[PDB]
């Protein structure tokens, strides 16, 4: 059966409606609770590389969305528009009412190609997309969405233990071999200046080096493709999120050290 | 069953978003015409780690994903929201379905004020008993 | 609280329309392809504002319409069939949701003619005393 | 909470599921009621142009549908096709299963042209479109409405109190600026033939100024446009619809005094 | 009523098809992206006709027809879920949508545990009557 | 109302919810089943000429759709590709997550043209189109069915009495005048070679039928329509399935005795 939270002992415990004791008292649907969590907080690496690893492609399966009323404020969120070599679409378009997910501090919006040997990208380890109040098994073109999992909770009737505004800030990425073992990446600072991505690459020190590059006037000044790297010795932060120069020339591969 | 935290890390807090139910009532703002779009009806709060809840929710969500996922399988339904109208069902079936034995253990009617309600009215019987 | 109708005007008449459940059993007019098209499915009838209660039904359908809204913008279904029966449900839940404490003003459970079966019943006992 | 009506002491009152005592009785969902109300039933106005000043665009707002169970007979419905001046469509089809509302005396069918600035076009009361027992907050293409609102009632399991056919007349209209403070409607005789169209004129003022026309031969008989305007002088009908000459020429407008 | 099946035939078994609302255990199965694709979801079962279930069964469903085609014919939703879940609203509220009048025939309390709790315990008051 | 099944004295019987009594026990929402059952099982005749005159098309009626969670394993259902004379499709597409009936031991293909005189296709006994646990008034483009019906029970909390894999076979057809009193079938071989159908052609006896027209090589050897004909005198099977040679020539038609 679906488990269902309830507090017992001045501790969260698992049952169901079959489980309880007459003491437990259900007044009002308004006791029900779904709440979406985000895998964030469970400790998962959260960097682009990281992330689409977790995602596949797989026909056969129908998509299945169920909703959520509450969530939990992002600071990582996906946003895909993924084509094949050939330019048709790999992901559907948002079914009518699936919006994006209402809070992320970063949208890792990833725009590029792969093969997408599937009708529909699914998560690998069981997780969920969550938009706007609906998780769904799958990905939607275009829409930003916070990978994590669902809960359902009987709340107490009145009190239930003992005793800065809304930012969003995109990042856009082009990818290469998409939902394959040999996937590349690039963080866009614009349409023709680009830095090849990695794992320990968080989003702040991606907006911080975006903004030296616009300050030191290290975009590239001709009709071409100018990709800069940083070589291993340069850090950029092991810890969660809620707990925390010179360049030089060689499209046209660059080094920053 | 009890809810063991078994992930690499917690975030003890819960920086959550959601809507209100009955939540424009300053003058015309409850007219969908006049009132907030779709981005400006969120309520926000947070909430800490008293009694390990936000924790024990984490954990929860995470062993609810197995069962979830094959009930959503099972059904052709494309998008589901009965699931806690069918637990609130569900709920009421498994006290209320059968006959209640009184004093059972599964039958939820206290009749604590209707023993001594009847304790209280033997003595106008056997208290007044006057020859 | 008390309906007060504060409309400028009211129809006292309620002409209505609505579809009925179980209605055409007359012979083949049941199955889809020999019955009625979408717009012979109605049946018709008129009432008369006895008790002042068509227009207070025009008085609670206009009240009725912030509360509708704010819980249709909060709601992520796109068409809501679900009013009733949740009202249905929270009905059983306020009275039976607990336990029923017998004679409680929350418990919905009379003991009446189980009060005179016991007061008709001790006297085969105090009645029947016999040395 | 949603307020649920409830017959007691002889009146309608308010209260919820709450709010009850163990003596009320819900002991079948058939005793539940959703009823759609309209707006006429109130005394407001009900001509084109008093109608159509309630109504407006907006955007960012998600469309909601509910559905009703039974409603009221109407004297007047709507049924608009209005287009932007560069010919793309103001309102959307109606989804999968909307259709018009079943009992209209007479559907005020208004063509025409506006701004249109918004996605849907919603009601400026807060109201609601009422359809086949679908009530939405929006305005469908070409789909017949009554305004109304929406109540929700607990009836009783037996008796609730101490103690001609259906015709439906299509009325056509001509908009220009439709959704402005300068909104100019012309009422249609044919499609050469218009009165131009007063708050004032009622339904049945129309129909027998359509009949005047035709059988006193006063239709556009050239391929020209003819402008009928009635000067203030002459009376049509401030009552509500349940309690209740000659021609000559100055596009080509013209008098009926 | 009872089920008088008035069919032509009636095939006495009933080899079935479900699915599992709980059934992947093993492994990785219960995860979409690894798990059955549509057509593998199903389990089998094999019914005979003890106290003639099976052709009883043919035969409700036939007679179940006409007033499912009728409910049909008046709802507006295009696929309808709810009809198990309103005929358990419904058994609920025809036990206990009213007050439970104990030992009426309407009223699903059973007092046979609290009847001999108080015969037994008048003998600590008309037994213990001590001088 | 909708009829109820329960079990009582050993016995299905009809009530309801309200004609229960306080000994029946419903505990769970478990214990609540749908179930679909195949007209097959009420003995119906199931060769395609006679199944096809069971269904028509109308208009006006809009069609609806209800769930069922359990089926039986069919040997007839149907998948049906219809057209008018000009081309234009004679049913809907499938709406989405309406797959096709999951057990079927022969599906009859039919492809073919027709009047089609009505927007949607119904069953005129007033019986259903059963899909994937959803069941409809209609027939769908190009989805495999089978006609029944549903019925609803509440079972035991228990027990409820006292006391091979699956294999598909399509077989297809060509038709001319669907849905009308002269409909023409030809059973077909292969793409120039076909069998006028009858209706005591069994799906066995056509599968052997066409075993030995491929393995007597007797199919169409030209670039043209070679149609069989089986003379009257040779039988093939008034028996329910669950209780169960020389070729000469005369478009091209031609005699099987
Ligand atoms: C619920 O929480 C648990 C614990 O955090 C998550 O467990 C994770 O499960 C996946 C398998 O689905 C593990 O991935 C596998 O790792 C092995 C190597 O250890 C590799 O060989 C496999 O190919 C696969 O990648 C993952 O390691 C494991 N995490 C931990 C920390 O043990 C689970 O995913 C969560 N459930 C949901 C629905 O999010
Ligand atoms: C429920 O019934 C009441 C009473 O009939 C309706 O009240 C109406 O509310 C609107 C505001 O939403 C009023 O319109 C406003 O009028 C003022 C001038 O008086 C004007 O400055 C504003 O711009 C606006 O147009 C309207 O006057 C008022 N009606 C009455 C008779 O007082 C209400 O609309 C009904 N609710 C629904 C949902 O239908
Ligand atoms: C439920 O089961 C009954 C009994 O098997 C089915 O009854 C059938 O009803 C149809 C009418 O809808 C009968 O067809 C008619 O036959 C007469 C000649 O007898 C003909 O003149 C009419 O034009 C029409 O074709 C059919 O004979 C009858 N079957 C039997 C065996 O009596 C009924 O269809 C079943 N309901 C569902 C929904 O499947
Ligand atoms: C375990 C419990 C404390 C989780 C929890 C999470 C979110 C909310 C918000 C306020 C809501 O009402 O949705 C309440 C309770
Ligand atoms: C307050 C009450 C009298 C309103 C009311 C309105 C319509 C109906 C129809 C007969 C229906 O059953 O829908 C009943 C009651
Ligand atoms: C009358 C009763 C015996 C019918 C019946 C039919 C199918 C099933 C399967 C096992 C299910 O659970 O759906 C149970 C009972
Ligand atoms: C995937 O790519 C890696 C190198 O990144 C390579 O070693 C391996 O052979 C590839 N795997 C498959 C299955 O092709
Ligand atoms: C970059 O390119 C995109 C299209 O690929 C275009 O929409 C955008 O305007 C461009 N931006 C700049 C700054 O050139
Ligand atoms: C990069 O820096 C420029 C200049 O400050 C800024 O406009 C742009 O938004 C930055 N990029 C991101 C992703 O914030
Ligand atoms: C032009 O190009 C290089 C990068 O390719 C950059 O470092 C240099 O500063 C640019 N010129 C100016 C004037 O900024
Ligand atoms: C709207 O039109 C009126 C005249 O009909 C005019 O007085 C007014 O200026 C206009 N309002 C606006 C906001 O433009
Ligand atoms: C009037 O014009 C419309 C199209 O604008 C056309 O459909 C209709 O047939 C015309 N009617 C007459 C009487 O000319
Ligand atoms: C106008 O009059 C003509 C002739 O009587 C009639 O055919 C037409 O329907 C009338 N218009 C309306 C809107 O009824
Ligand atoms: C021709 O035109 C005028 C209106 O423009 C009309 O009054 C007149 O009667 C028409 N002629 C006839 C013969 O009806
Ligand atoms: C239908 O066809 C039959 C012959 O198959 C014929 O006798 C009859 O006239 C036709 N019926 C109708 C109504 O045209
Ligand atoms: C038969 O024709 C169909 C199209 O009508 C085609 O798809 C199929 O490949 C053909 N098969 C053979 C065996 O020729
Ligand atoms: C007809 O026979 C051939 C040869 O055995 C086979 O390939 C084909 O599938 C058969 N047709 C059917 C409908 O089974
Ligand atoms: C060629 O055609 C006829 C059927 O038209 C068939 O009986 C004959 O056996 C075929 N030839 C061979 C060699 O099979």
Same mark, same amino acid.
């Given at each position: 059966s ?7 002992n ?18 009002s ?24 690893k ?19 404020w ?6 895909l528009?993924?084509?094949?070599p ?11 009412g ?8 970063y ?13 529909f ?6 997780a ?9 098994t799958?990905?939607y ?9 669902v809960a359902?909770?009987?709340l ?13 800030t ?6 290469t071999?998409?939902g394959?073992n ?9 349409n ?5 991505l990695?794992?320990?690459f ?6 911080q ?11 590239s ?6 990709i800069?790297?940083?070589n ?6 092991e ?8 360049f ?10 | ?11 003890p807090?819960?920086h ?9 009532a ?15 009806i969120?309520?926000?709060?947070l909430?800490?780690?008293?009694d390990?809840?936000?924790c +024990?929710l984490?954990?929860?969500?995470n ?15 494309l ?17 209320? +379905? ?5 004093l059972?253990?599964?039958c939820?009617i ?7 309600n009847?304790?209280?009215k033997?003595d106008?019987?056997?208290?007044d008993?006057?020859d």
């Amino acid at each position: 059966s679906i488990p269902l939270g309830v507090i017992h002992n001045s501790a969260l415990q698992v049952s169901d409606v079959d489980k309880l004791v007459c003491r437990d008292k259900l007044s009002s649907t308004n006791q029900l609770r779904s709440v979406g969590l985000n895998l964030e907080g469970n400790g998962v690496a959260t960097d682009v590389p990281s992330a689409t690893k977790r995602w596949g492609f797989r026909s056969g399966v129908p998509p299945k969305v169920v909703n959520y009323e509450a969530g939990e404020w992002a600071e990582n969120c996906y946003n895909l528009e993924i084509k094949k070599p050939d330019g048709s679409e790999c992901l559907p378009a948002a079914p009518d009412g699936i919006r994006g997910f209402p809070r992320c501090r970063y949208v890792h919006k990833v725009s590029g190609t792969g093969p997408c040997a599937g009708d529909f990208a699914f998560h690998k380890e069981g997780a969920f997309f969550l938009y706007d109040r609906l998780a769904s098994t799958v990905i939607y073109r275009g829409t930003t969405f916070a990978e994590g999992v669902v809960a359902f909770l009987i709340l107490p009737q009145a009190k239930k233990d003992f005793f800065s505004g809304y930012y969003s800030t995109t990042i856009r990425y082009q990818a290469t071999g998409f939902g394959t073992n040999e996937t590349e990446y690039l963080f866009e600072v614009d349409n023709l200046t680009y830095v090849q991505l990695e794992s320990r690459f968080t989003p702040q020190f991606l907006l911080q080096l975006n903004e030296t590059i616009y300050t030191s006037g290290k975009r590239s000044n001709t009709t071409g493709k100018l990709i800069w790297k940083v070589n291993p010795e340069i850090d950029t932060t092991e810890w969660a999120f809620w707990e925390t120069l010179s360049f030089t020339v060689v499209x046209x591969x660059x080094x920053x050290x | 069953e009890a809810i063991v935290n078994a992930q690499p890390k917690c975030n003890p807090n819960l920086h959550y978003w959601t809507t209100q139910d009955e939540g424009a009532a300053i003058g015309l703002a409850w007219i969908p015409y006049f009132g907030p779009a779709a981005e400006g009806i969120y309520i926000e709060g947070l909430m800490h780690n008293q009694d390990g809840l936000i924790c +024990g929710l984490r954990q929860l969500a995470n062993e609810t994903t197995q069962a979830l996922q094959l009930f959503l399988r099972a059904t052709t339904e494309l998008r589901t929201f009965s699931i806690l109208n069918r637990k609130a069902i569900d709920f009421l079936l498994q006290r209320w +379905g059968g006959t209640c034995h009184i004093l059972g253990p599964d039958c939820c009617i206290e009749p604590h004020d209707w023993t001594k309600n009847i304790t209280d009215k033997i003595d106008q019987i056997i208290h007044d008993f006057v020859d």
